C-alpha cells in the first residue's frame, strides 16, 4: 500500500518488511540512501549561504541608505524578512535534521518548523501580490486624485501577515496538519494524505483557490494592465527614446516576474492537484521534494529579481559592499 501510517506522520515507504520507523525516532535510511540525505543537507547549506546574506543585506542597506526608506519599498522589506523566516525557520532546521536522517525535534518541533516555514513562504507570496497591486495602482492610476502614501504601504504589509496566518495557523488548530514531508526531515502542510479527522481535502481546495488561483489572477491582471499602460504611453510618445526603453524594460521585468512566480508555485499546485484528482496512488519521498525544491529556492531568486535587479537597491548594495565606492 506504499505507505506506513502513524499518529502524526506518513512515511512514503511500505512496512511489509518491518523496517519502517517513526520519522521522529529513527533515521529514514530505508527510503533514501545516506548520501542522498547529505545532498539534502548540502542544498540547504547552499540556500543558507546565498539566502541569508542577500536577504539580510537588503535590510542592512535600507538602514544605511535613507532614500530606500520609501513607502513603495516597504513591501520589498517585507519580502526580505519573509525569506529570512524561510532561512531560519526551515532551511537551518532541515540542515540539522537531514544530518540526523530524520526529524529529531519531534511532533512539537514539526508544528513549529512547519508553521514558520509556511508563514515565511506565504508572506513572501502575498508580498508579491501586494507589490503588483501597488504598482498597478501607482502607474495605471485606476483611482482619480489618489496618492500612495505611508499608511497604504503599512496596510499592504499587514495584509500579507493576515493572509499568511490564514494559511499557516489553521493546521495548528485542526484544519489539515503539519507532518514530515518527503525524506521526512522537514515539515509542511499535509496535502497528500486523506486525513478526514482534520478535513485535509477542504483545506487543500481552500489553499488552491485562495492562496494560488486568486494570487495568480491578481498578479496577471495587475501586471497585464501595467504592460498595457506603458505600451500605450510609449505608443502616444514615440518621439521619446527613453519612453521606448522603459516599455521594453518593463515588459521584460513583468515576464521575468510572472515566470518566476509560476516556477515557484505551479509545482506545488500541480502535485496537489494531481494527488487530489488521483487519490489512491504511490508517491515517492524524492518525488514530494521536487515541488519543495522550487518553492524554497525562491528565497534566493526572488530577492535577486525584486531587489538586486532593482536599480535603487542594487546601487546602494554596491556602495555598501565596496566601501563607499559607487
Amino acid at each position: 500500500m506504499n505507505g506506513t501510517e502513524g499518529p502524526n506522520f506518513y512515511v512514503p515507504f511500505s512496512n511489509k518488511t518491518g523496517v519502517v520507523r517513526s520519522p521522529f525516532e529513527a533515521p529514514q535510511y530505508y527510503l533514501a540512501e545516506p548520501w542522498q540525505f547529505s545532498m539534502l543537507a548540502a542544498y540547504m547549506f547552499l540556500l543558507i549561504m546565498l539566502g541569508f546574506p542577500i536577504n539580510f543585506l537588503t535590510l542592512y542597506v535600507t538602514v544605511q541608505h535613507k532614500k530606500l526608506r520609501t513607502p513603495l519599498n516597504y513591501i520589498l522589506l517585507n519580502l526580505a524578512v519573509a525569506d529570512l523566516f524561510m532561512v531560519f525557520g526551515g532551511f537551518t532546521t532541515t540542515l540539522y535534521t537531514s544530518l540526523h536522517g530524520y526529524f529529531v525535534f519531534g511532533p512539537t518541533g514539526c508544528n513549529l518548523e512547519g508553521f514558520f516555514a509556511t508563514l515565511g513562504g506565504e508572506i513572501a507570496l502575498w508580498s508579491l501580490v501586494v507589490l503588483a497591486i501597488e504598482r498597478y495602482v501607482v502607474v495605471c492610476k485606476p483611482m482619480s486624485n489618489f496618492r500612495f502614501g505611508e499608511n497604504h504601504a503599512i496596510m499592504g504589509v499587514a495584509f500579507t501577515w493576515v493572509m499568511a496566518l490564514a494559511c499557516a495557523a489553521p493546521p495548528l488548530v485542526g484544519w489539515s496538519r503539519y507532518i514530515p514531508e518527503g525524506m521526512q526531515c522537514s515539515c509542511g502542510i499535509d496535502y497528500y494524505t486523506p486525513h478526514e479527522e482534520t478535513n485535509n481535502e477542504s483545506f487543500v481546495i481552500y489553499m488552491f483557490v485562495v492562496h494560488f488561483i486568486i494570487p495568480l489572477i491578481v498578479i496577471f491582471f495587475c501586471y497585464g494592465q501595467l504592460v498595457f499602460t506603458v505600451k500605450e504611453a510609449a505608443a502616444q510618445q514615440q518621439e521619446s527614446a527613453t519612453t521606448q526603453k522603459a516599455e521594453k524594460e518593463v515588459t521584460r521585468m513583468v515576464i521575468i516576474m510572472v515566470i518566476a512566480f509560476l516556477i515557484c508555485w505551479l509545482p506545488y499546485a500541480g502535485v496537489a492537484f494531481y494527488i487530489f484528482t488521483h487519490q489512491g496512488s504511490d508517491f515517492g519521498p524524492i518525488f514530494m521534494t521536487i515541488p519543495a525544491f522550487f518553492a524554497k529556492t525562491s528565497a534566493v531568486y526572488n530577492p535577486v529579481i525584486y531587489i538586486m535587479m532593482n536599480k535603487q537597491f542594487r546601487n546602494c548594495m554596491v556602495t555598501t559592499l565596496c566601501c563607499g565606492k559607487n
Binding site: 504598482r135 524594460e249 532593482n310
Partner: peptide
C-alpha cells in the same frame, strides 16, 4: 509615466 515607474523600481 516614467516617474511612476522609477518610483516603483521598474525603470
Amino acid at each position: 509615466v516614467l516617474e511612476d515607474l522609477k518610483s516603483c523600481g521598474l525603470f
